[PDB]
Design a protein around this nucleic acid. Structure first.
Ligand SMILES: *C(=O)[C@H](Cc1ccccc1)NC(=O)CCCCCN
Ligand code: CL
Ligand code: CL
Ligand code: CL
Ligand code: K
Ligand code: MG
Ligand code: MG
Ligand code: MG
Ligand code: MG
Ligand code: MG
Ligand code: MG
Ligand code: MG
Ligand code: MG
Ligand code: MG
Ligand code: MG
Ligand code: MG
Ligand code: MG
Ligand code: MG
Ligand code: MG
Ligand code: MG
Ligand code: MG
Ligand code: MG
Ligand code: MG
Ligand code: MG
Ligand code: MG
Ligand code: MG
Ligand code: MG
Ligand code: MG
Ligand code: MG
Ligand code: MG
Ligand code: MG
Ligand code: MG
Ligand code: MG
Ligand code: MG
Ligand code: MG
Ligand code: MG
Ligand code: MG
Ligand code: MG
Ligand code: MG
Ligand code: MG
Ligand code: MG
Ligand code: MG
Ligand code: MG
Ligand code: MG
Ligand code: MG
Ligand code: MG
Ligand code: MG
Ligand code: MG
Ligand code: MG
Ligand code: MG
Ligand code: MG
Ligand code: MG
Ligand code: NA
Ligand code: NA
Ligand code: NA
Ligand code: NA
Ligand code: NA
Ligand code: NA
Ligand code: NA
Ligand code: NA
Ligand code: NA
Ligand code: NA
Ligand code: NA
Ligand code: NA
Ligand code: NA
Ligand code: NA
Ligand code: NA
Ligand code: NA
Ligand code: NA
Ligand code: NA
Ligand code: NA
Ligand code: NA
Ligand code: NA
Lengths: 237, 73, 56
RNA sequence: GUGGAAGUCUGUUAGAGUUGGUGUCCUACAAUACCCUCUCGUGAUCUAUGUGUAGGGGUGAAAGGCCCAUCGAGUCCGGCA
RNA sequence: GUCGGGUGAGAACCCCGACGGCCUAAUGGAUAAGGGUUCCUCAGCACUGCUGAUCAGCUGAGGGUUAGCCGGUCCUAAGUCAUACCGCAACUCGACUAUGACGAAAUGGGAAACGGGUUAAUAUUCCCGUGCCACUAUGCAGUGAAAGUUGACGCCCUGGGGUCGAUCACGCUGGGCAUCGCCCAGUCGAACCGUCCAACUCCGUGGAAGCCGUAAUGGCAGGAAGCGGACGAACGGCGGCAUAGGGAAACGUGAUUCAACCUGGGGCCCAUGAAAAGACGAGCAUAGUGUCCGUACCGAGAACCGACACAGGUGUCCAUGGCGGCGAAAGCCAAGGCCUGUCGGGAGCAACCAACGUUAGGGAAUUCGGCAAGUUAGUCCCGUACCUUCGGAAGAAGGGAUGCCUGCUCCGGAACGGAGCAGGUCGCAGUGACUCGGAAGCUCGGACUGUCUAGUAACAACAUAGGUGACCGCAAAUCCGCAAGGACUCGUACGGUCACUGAAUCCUGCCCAGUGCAGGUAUCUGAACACCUCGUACAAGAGGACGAAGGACCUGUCAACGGCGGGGGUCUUAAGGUAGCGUAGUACCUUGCCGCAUCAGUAGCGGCUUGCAUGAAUGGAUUAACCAGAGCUUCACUGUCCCAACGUUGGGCCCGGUGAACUGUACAUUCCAGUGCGGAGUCUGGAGACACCCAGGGGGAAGCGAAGACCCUAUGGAGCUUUACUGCAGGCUGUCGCUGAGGACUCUCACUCCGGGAGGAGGACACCGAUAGCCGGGCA
RNA sequence: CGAGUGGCUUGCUACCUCGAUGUCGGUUCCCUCCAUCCUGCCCGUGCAGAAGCGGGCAAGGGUGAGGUUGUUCGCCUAUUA
RNA sequence: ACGACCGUAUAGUACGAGAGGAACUACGGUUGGUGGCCACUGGUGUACCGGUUGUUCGAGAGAGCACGUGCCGGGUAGCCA
């Protein structure tokens, strides 16, 4: 047959690419020689086309002007600080070690200095639970308990824009406009509505999948469709 | 509110659009000053027409249940 | 809309043009590559053995 | 009362589409045309130009549709008498 | 088109005049692409032109395109290329990372030009007049000078400023008409220089505890109004330009509505609406320089694409010409263009055909079906059911009004804006043409807008929000690449990938035996390397020990594939069909039975229902709204029918000119019978038959068109499927190499990742190379 | 039970056509057959009459309109010689 | 090139207990078919005459266009049922 849609994706053609050229900034923690002295002033609050969430423009003492992954509650004028000795208030960034356990955090680094990887979407947050001289245990929004180097920097507070998911799109048109701001092919045609040549679920006098939908982890691309390595399906039990 | 939708989309969809948007459009009390002059400037962005204070808040509410837990902890 | 005569009307785009290297109206002005001599793609001249019968 | 929302309504505004007539045509005006009728017409809208994706590959709101009158695997030459 | 006339050997169609028409977002004006000399002049008619031609986009020969201030050029966009680097057996191949360059002529950004005149043909290019920009040089001024501003920005609603146009009033100039006194045209004048400034913002004064303000929102003791001031707009006003220019002349003044242009306020986003060059910031005189490329013409029912002078296709601007009216609508008419959607002449002009008008009485009897046609229609007032997701249904339905003339009222600053009143009055008819819904009900489907088979399918199919399950903590999941590398990703679980269902509402039962996926696993099975035994002076080879993933086995899982019966008052094989729905778009029997409706109803709807063979996200039921979706009923309507007629226009028929194609073994005036490979103009017997020609509607030539697309056959082909055969990618897993120190363990030095670096994490693992086992229609 | 006639149904056969003889139904228009439905002339009757039933000759003419269904067929209604 | 039916007289008669109920013949009409014809009725009648809407020719008068009559009302001849 023909390569299935999931395979066209990888080639990275226009249709599957994100409108990068239309994006604003790659949100990452600033680099500080040391000392922490680094502080700056919120100059404005903008909309981030890549995350459908607000972002804060900040002017730093040493002249640097960069957009920042804004937590909820940051306003123009506020003074943010980044470093080991940063005060402990929302919007400030400092290593997990210097952060008091029990405090909600966002934009957490996977490894010290990577600029933040975890908890960055609308209204989410990580939860610093345990400290140590060797391991900082954080609970990520997925519920998992992650062990991190206490040297990993983070931002205090939860990400701005919480509750975005609460309102339904209501109409195809709204999805449309959102989708146009992401690296995604939309709308979605069901495999079972295709021809046998286009998808392992395609074909038939009526619409139904050919075999069972749970596919092995070892299935090859072109065949790995449906419920991938499902440990279970349905809702019962 | 949801009345712009006519008889389309069904109960839940538009009841929630009205609910969200009514809270959304409510008078909100500015964090800097204390006046109820906070209006939504866009997704997650809020501002006081009184003092001009521009804040980061929820998407349809200036404050979220989680943003409040922060203040405490 | 018919794919024939009615679709022939929008054909006012220029692509192939007189080539600076070989003189054939085969220089694709959009690609900047000659389909006839390879100008723009190859320093060597475009040529294949299949342009003639195998034993000739 | 004000306000003026809406993949909202009427609409041959422009523009887009193509339901019925199984009309006219069917060595045609035309290798998909003509007329009447009909649908949409602030939006997932229509459009020009530029630009990207190439053949077991693209592209596809999925009809095996489309990729220059060529598609259940384009076209050209070659393998090839 | 017609009548006259011109030219010519020749004139229906070349030219002049009149008369008559056609085109009004185009049949007018300016242009992009594209064409390429088609442009202009002269001379021609062998070619081309649907006839002819003196004409021409044709033939021949000449001529024609003039720029500091219009484009290009310059900038950067999506993105492209080149070099370097790396890959590859290799390259004209290939991703990333650097650098450089390229990438916009209507229509992105952008230093500067206006008016008149002129040619057969160019024109913001030439000429006259006036203006402007940039650079450089000289001189005076200036030390400022780079911070900032600008370039530079989405969708929806709206106020204010305001020019042209259009219109109204009055005057002037010219024209038209001739029962009045009306009607038409004009009444001009740039860039640029100077000046004015509403809005926004801000300052001082002031001191509001209820005031200020808007079309609307709004504003304020954190200082409202008022007052005074700073900054500050037009392609706008005003003055110059201008005893410039233009006009035969007059060479106006005011007003309204106000495109352009300027400047504000509000609202929306799970959508956030370029960049760079450049300009400003940053004065003035004088002088010099301002090269290079484009410039003709068409821009379309004859200059473009479609083989054609093709009824097709093809972007932008003129959206403000008049009446009309809601209108960029119809109809009519200007300006401008045209009679080239280019063959004509004749017959009351028959049959027949295309478009179409009107048809008495009946009124869907027509037909698969009301297909086709018709009915209704604009605006105002009254009035409006079931149902409903409270939005809607709804213009439901139904009823009434509607002109002109005279005199008025009300809203408003006013309109040549709107709403009404009284009286008079004509017609069959006052939305008098034109424009302009037929209405109501039941049932099925999909919720809705949307999408689709370019060229027989527009639908119930696809999409959709909504519901649901699956995978993944990012050195991820998924996916592309041979590799170097890459998409997702300027992303991070409120994420995004992989699938199923398909708005809302009420719901979604039972089954894990088979198959799939996943987890576990004492024991069993399970390859290769290394190891042990035998064998071989070595080797092949045989066997053992150990045993990864995987399998056996156990468990979880159905909104995973799917299943939900026979028999009796359990059996196959796990369960044995729950809520619902039901003769279904699923019901074989079948036109099931009863009822509604009709004279009569295989239809439709309702009830029953043992359901050949309904049923729950293979979603079940149900459902307001929506629909060029399927079926049915009623009112209205009518040439669909009874049953046809008459008429209109274009053909048809005759004449001049032009001038194909299909098809043709031969012969051929046939008919009735027979015969024949059983479907004969031609054989046989009879019958009929003088030749040629015109018109017709198509009985026959098993008429023409197409080496049947059905069916079979061929050790034919292709696309597709899978627990067909055989293999190949890919994933998982063991082993060896990289690879190091001291059946479980530490370390650091290779190697990998994070960090700008210092250094941190990981670590002999991973990656990569080689091999072995398992899975493996993803692919051949 | 026996003997036949037709060639409308159905089946069988594979002779004819696969370099194609266009499908069902309907419609329109023409000719024909008789195994006669009506009409004419007759015979019998379980023929009083009236109304029938059955049969013979006979193909001149007639044999119509509608409701369901694509239907052919068929069911149904009212007219009818 | 004519087919067929209904009605009246026959007759409330023949026949028959009654109920009921004919015929020959002579008449009138209807239906289908056929051929022709237009005084009569009816249709058409873009000959014609009138009314009137919009617009243009300044008004008036008189006219053009509104699809091959703008629309409405009437309609001769002929052709027709
Ligand atoms: C069955 O009778 C087939 C049906 C069919 C076949 C192929 C495509 C569509 C439908 N019909 C025929 O075979 C008709 C044949 C016509 C032959 C004429 N000379
Ligand atoms: Cl989303
Ligand atoms: Cl130009
Ligand atoms: Cl305003
Ligand atoms: K055949
Ligand atoms: Mg980033
Ligand atoms: Mg919405
Ligand atoms: Mg996209
Ligand atoms: Mg879908
Ligand atoms: Mg399909
Ligand atoms: Mg497949
Ligand atoms: Mg389905
Ligand atoms: Mg399904
Ligand atoms: Mg094609
Ligand atoms: Mg709409
Ligand atoms: Mg419409
Ligand atoms: Mg394009
Ligand atoms: Mg198919
Ligand atoms: Mg010429
Ligand atoms: Mg000449
Ligand atoms: Mg460039
Ligand atoms: Mg430009
Ligand atoms: Mg010219
Ligand atoms: Mg020119
Ligand atoms: Mg022509
Ligand atoms: Mg009638
Ligand atoms: Mg009928
Ligand atoms: Mg009928
Ligand atoms: Mg119709
Ligand atoms: Mg007043
Ligand atoms: Mg009317
Ligand atoms: Mg049904
Ligand atoms: Mg639909
Ligand atoms: Mg089609
Ligand atoms: Mg459709
Ligand atoms: Mg269609
Ligand atoms: Mg669907
Ligand atoms: Mg969702
Ligand atoms: Mg979904
Ligand atoms: Mg979902
Ligand atoms: Mg029923
Ligand atoms: Mg279920
Ligand atoms: Mg003979
Ligand atoms: Mg054949
Ligand atoms: Mg077949
Ligand atoms: Mg095959
Ligand atoms: Mg790295
Ligand atoms: Mg295969
Ligand atoms: Mg034939
Ligand atoms: Mg007989
Ligand atoms: Mg006869
Ligand atoms: Mg007329
Ligand atoms: Na399938
Ligand atoms: Na209101
Ligand atoms: Na059409
Ligand atoms: Na191919
Ligand atoms: Na070949
Ligand atoms: Na000025
Ligand atoms: Na007007
Ligand atoms: Na001509
Ligand atoms: Na729509
Ligand atoms: Na099972
Ligand atoms: Na199982
Ligand atoms: Na089932
Ligand atoms: Na639709
Ligand atoms: Na008619
Ligand atoms: Na014939
Ligand atoms: Na195939
Ligand atoms: Na026989
Ligand atoms: Na044949
Ligand atoms: Na037939
Ligand atoms: Na007879
Ligand atoms: Na019938």
């Amino acid at each position: 047959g023909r390569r299935i849609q999931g395979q066209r994706r990888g080639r990275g053609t226009s249709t599957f690419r994100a409108p990068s050229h239309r994006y604003k900034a790659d949100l990452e923690h600033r680099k500080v020689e040391d000392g922490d002295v680094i502080a700056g002033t919120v100059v404005d609050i903008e909309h981030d086309p890549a995350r459908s969430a607000p972002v804060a423009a900040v002017e730093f003492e040493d002249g640097d002007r960069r957009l920042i992954l804004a937590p909820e509650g940051v306003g123009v004028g506020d003074e943010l600080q980044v470093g080991v000795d940063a005060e402990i208030a929302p919007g400030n960034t400092l290593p997990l070690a210097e952060i008091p356990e029990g405090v909600p955090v966002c934009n957490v680094e996977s490894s010290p200095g990577d600029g933040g990887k975890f908890a960055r979407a609308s209204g989410v947050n990580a939860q610093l639970l345990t400290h140590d001289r060797n391991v900082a245990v954080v609970k990520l929004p997925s519920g998992e308990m992650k062990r991190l180097d206490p040297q990993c920097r983070a931002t205090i507070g939860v990400v701005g824009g919480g509750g975005r998911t609460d309102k339904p799109f209501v109409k195809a048109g709204n999805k449309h406009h959102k989708m146009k701001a992401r690296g995604t092919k939309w709308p979605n045609v069901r495999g079972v509505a295709m021809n046998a040549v286009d998808h392992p679920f395609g074909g038939g006098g009526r619409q139904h999948p050919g075999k069972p939908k749970s596919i092995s982890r070892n299935a090859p691309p072109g065949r790995k469709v449906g419920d991938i390595a499902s440990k279970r399906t349905g809702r019962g039990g | 509110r949801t009345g712009r939708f006519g008889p389309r989309y069904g109960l839940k969809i538009r009841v929630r659009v009205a609910d969200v948007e009514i809270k959304h459009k409510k008078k909100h009390k500015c964090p800097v000053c204390g006046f109820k002059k906070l209006k939504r400037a866009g997704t997650g962005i809020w501002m006081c027409g009184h003092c001009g204070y521009k804040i980061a808040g929820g998407c349809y509410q200036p404050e979220t249940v989680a943003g409040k837990a922060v203040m405490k902890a | 809309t018919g794919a024939g005569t009615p679709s022939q009307g929008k054909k006012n785009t220029t692509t192939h043009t007189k080539c600076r290297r070989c003189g054939e109206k085969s220089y694709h002005t959009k690609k900047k590559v000659c389909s006839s001599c390879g100008f723009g793609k190859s320093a060597k001249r475009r040529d294949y053995e299949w342009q003639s019968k195998a034993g000739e």
